[PDB]
Design a protein around this motif. Structure first.
Motif: not given
Ligand SMILES: [Zn+2]
Ligand SMILES: [Ca+2]
Ligand SMILES: [Ca+2]
Ligand SMILES: [Ca+2]
Ligand SMILES: [Zn+2]
Lengths: 164, 159
Positions: A1-2, B113-114, B117, B123
């Motif tokens: 999640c950003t 980033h995603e 995950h 995180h």
């Molecule tokens: Zn994230």
């Protein structure tokens, strides 16, 4: 999640509830049991958040039940919601200035002003009622001086500026 | 699942944001996969039909899963850890404006980033990690490099 980070003024002004609180499976949301010690906005015992970090679920890192936390959240259908993009911080991690913000000063900016995060290449101001927040640009973090010592307040009409 | 129980993964770019030409979405994502490929034994192959491991799409508001996007700003994207069906997938908020450079929201940086995950990373608390949950990286685009913190987390999963 950003997430776009919220400045504390933004978080205050956009949230339905701003409180200090202690924190005490196949399922969409998780909830933490909290004990509110103070309300700063919204005049409360659980806070809800998506169950995994990947879909923006706040993950509470603190193994001290007497630690107080500032939570700025959205009320929806009776329930307080937070996500990784909310402002949630231990009270004691705040600077004295930030504490006064939530207590008194941030409310002066809500109607007239907007904090705009500089997340991009030129990074352009749309209005004189905007203040440009460059903590991430400058110091690689949202926890910088503008966050911790500055509010975005009316100077004259059409003009908000950063003030302490 | 904490990790993919296999080394050879598939992805597909299911739809395209009107913000960007198709090739631009493609290069961003390819680049983002490359970042992870080059510090792990994993490989990624592009499918154009059917159900791939990592289904990648753009959506606004309510979009089929249980976590509605929220319009411009706030959350920019989200993803699901390893597993079947939805698990593994990446959704980008098309109420953001996706860019090839850093004039808007950089697709490559947010995909990277995603994809963390999608592979099993959570995180990070280090403001210098990719896995930091705030859109935190835009200043380093021209010579992008994974944090050692990110290197540590991905290699703890895949060697
Ligand atoms: Zn994230
Ligand atoms: Ca999948
Ligand atoms: Ca959004
Ligand atoms: Ca868009
Ligand atoms: Zn989604």
């Amino acid at each position: 999640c950003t997430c776009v980070p919220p400045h504390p003024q933004t978080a205050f002004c956009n949230s339905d509830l701003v409180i200090r609180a202690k924190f005490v499976q196949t399922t969409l949301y998780q909830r933490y049991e909290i004990k509110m010690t103070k309300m700063y906005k919204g005049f409360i015992r659980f806070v809800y958040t998506p169950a995994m970090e990947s879909v923006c679920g706040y993950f509470h890192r603190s193994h001290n039940r007497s630690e107080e936390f500032l939570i700025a959240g959205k009320l929806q259908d009776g329930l307080l919601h937070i996500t990784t993009c909310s402002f949630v911080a231990p009270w004691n991690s705040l600077s004295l200035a930030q504490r006064r913000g939530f207590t008194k000063t941030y409310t002066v900016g809500c109607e007239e002003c907007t904090v705009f995060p500089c997340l991009s290449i030129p990074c352009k101001l749309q209005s004189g009622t905007h203040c440009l927040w460059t903590d991430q640009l400058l110091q690689g973090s949202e926890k910088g001086f503008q966050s911790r010592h500055l509010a975005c307040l009316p100077r004259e009409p059409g003009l908000c500026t950063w003030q302490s | 699942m904490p990790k993919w129980r296999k080394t050879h993964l598939t992805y597909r770019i299911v739809n395209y944001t009107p913000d960007l030409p198709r090739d631009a979405v493609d290069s961003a994502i390819e680049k983002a996969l490359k970042v992870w490929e080059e510090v792990t034994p994993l490989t990624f192959s592009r499918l154009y039909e059917g159900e791939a491991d990592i289904m990648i799409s753009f959506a606004v508001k309510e979009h089929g899963d249980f976590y509605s996007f929220d319009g411009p700003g706030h959350s920019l994207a989200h993803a699901y850890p390893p597993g079947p069906g939805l698990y593994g997938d990446i959704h980008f908020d098309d109420d953001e404006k996706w860019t090839e450079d850093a004039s808007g929201t950089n697709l490559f940086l947010v995909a990277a980033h995603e994809l963390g995950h999608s592979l099993g990373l959570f995180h990070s608390a280090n403001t210098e990690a990719l896995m930091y949950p705030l859109y935190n990286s835009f200043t380093e685009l021209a010579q992008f490099r994974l944090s050692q913190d990110d290197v540590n987390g991905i290699q703890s999963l895949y060697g």
